[PDB]
């Protein structure tokens, strides 16, 4: 029974990406202080308990599934696509998500608002003409008041419908005040859609759409994610636990049931 750890994660042989102040979901969305992680890849992503969000206040209804899906894919490779958004203002920003001295927003999302006095029914399409799966991240804005809803989006109630040939999701925003987070009682809910080769993305909204800017390239393989506060150092160990790497000469280990790599069995 392997009973000791160095207390440090060895940076070999696995490609470790230390999240430092960032969770994987904040890196995915493009929280400004997480933008250093754009297009990065990993065998093991390490999330720290000190990680924090510093952008528009949000929730992700299927958080654990999105996180697991991205972690297994092992890359944040992102490709901007030329969505056309006619009759709305793009690149909206907020003082809850500062970028430098000014207002800003998630780097991978596009806050659309009315242009002039109208917000048309958006209906845009994006075919997948590649041979890999595309991951689209999108959102829905929940205004804190009815006045805010009509000021931003004109329509008294919005709707976001995103579909492929084999899926559809319709989200109705929920208006009302929440407690202030970085000054704001409004919220965004984050959703996702996978588009298989030969399929197509359709986005249809008459308000409250937080648009995707492109897609993440999905991959398959051995990548994962782990929560750990262990420091990284320069050394070699094939087996990583949140407590640190451990020797793998023994059949069992009692360090942690969470492990990554060629590891002894937990007992």
């Amino acid at each position, epitope marked *: 029974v392997q009973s000791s750890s160095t207390g440090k994660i060895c940076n070999n042989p696995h490609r470790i990406l230390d999240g430092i102040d960032c969770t994987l979901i904040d890196a995915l969305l493009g929280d400004p202080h997480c933008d250093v992680f754009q297009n990065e890849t990993w065998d093991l992503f390490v999330e720290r*308990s000190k990680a*924090f969000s510093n952008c528009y206040p*949000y*929730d992700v209804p299927d958080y654990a599934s999105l996180r697991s899906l991205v972690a297994s894919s092992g890359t944040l490779e992102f490709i901007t696509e030329g969505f056309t958004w006619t009759g709305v203002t793009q690149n909206g920003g907020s003082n809850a998500c500062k970028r430098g001295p000014g207002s800003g927003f998630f780097s991978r999302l596009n806050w659309l608002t009315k242009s002039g006095s109208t917000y048309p029914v958006l209906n845009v399409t994006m075919p997948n003409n590649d041979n890999f799966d595309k991951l689209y991240i999108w959102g829905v804005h929940h205004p804190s008041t009815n006045q805010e809803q009509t000021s931003l989006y004109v329509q008294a109630s919005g709707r976001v419908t995103v579909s492929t040939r084999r899926s559809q999701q319709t989200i109705i925003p929920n208006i*009302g005040s*929440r*407690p*202030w*987070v970085r000054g704001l009682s409004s919220r965004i809910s984050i959703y996702w859609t996978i588009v298989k080769p030969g399929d197509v993305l359709v986005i249809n909204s008459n308000g409250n759409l937080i648009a995707p800017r492109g897609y993440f390239k999905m991959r398959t393989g051995k990548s994962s994610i782990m929560r750990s506060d262990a420091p990284i150092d320069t050394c070699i160990s094939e087996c990583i636990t949140p407590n640190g790497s451990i020797p793998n000469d023994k059949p069992f280990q009692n360090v942690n049931k969470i492990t990554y790599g060629a590891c002894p069995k937990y007992v």
Partner: antibody
Amino acid sequence: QVQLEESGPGLVKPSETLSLTCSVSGVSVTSDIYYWTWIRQPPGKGLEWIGYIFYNGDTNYNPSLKSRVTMSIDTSKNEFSLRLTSVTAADTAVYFCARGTEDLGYCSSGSCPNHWGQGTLVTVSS
Amino acid sequence: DIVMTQSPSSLSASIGDRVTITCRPSQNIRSFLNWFQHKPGKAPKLLIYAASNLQSGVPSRFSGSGSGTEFTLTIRSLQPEDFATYYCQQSYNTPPTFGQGTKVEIKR
């Protein structure tokens, strides 16, 4: 944006049922995202959360009180209410009603009452 | 069932002074921690939500910090109107639970 006025007897006899009402002004109790909460504080003691109720029927009561407490929302009167059975002197307290907003990015469901009433004292005595 | 240990139970400080109140939950609660202020005869008021977010109308001399198992409410330059009892409140699992409170008194 909301006002919350509590009402109810003030004196309840031991073993009897305590009933309180919260009159809500400024929003509708039929809204999908708000929940309505009661909290209490015995004289000279700490605050104790009682429970929450959503218009859709979802409720959660403190296990210390769950086998004696119920809540309801009266949509017609724009009120919500507390019912606490088989009271003793331990239930003498200031009772506060409160509103919160479902916000699962930052809060457990129904767990962050952020607009409170000023409280009404209930004394359990013969 | 999470026990919130606030300290000190009471403190006195002069006008203009910096005041610090600590809260230590009985288990790690990440950032699911709120701070309430309760002035005599008024409704308890949420001051800080999710460990560090200032509520509307709250003066910027109030700030919340920390995460995990240790949280701090700071009042950076105490004013007479800040006389109140302050409570921490965890929103991490049910039932929500409160600290036993810190009574802040003004020295003059």
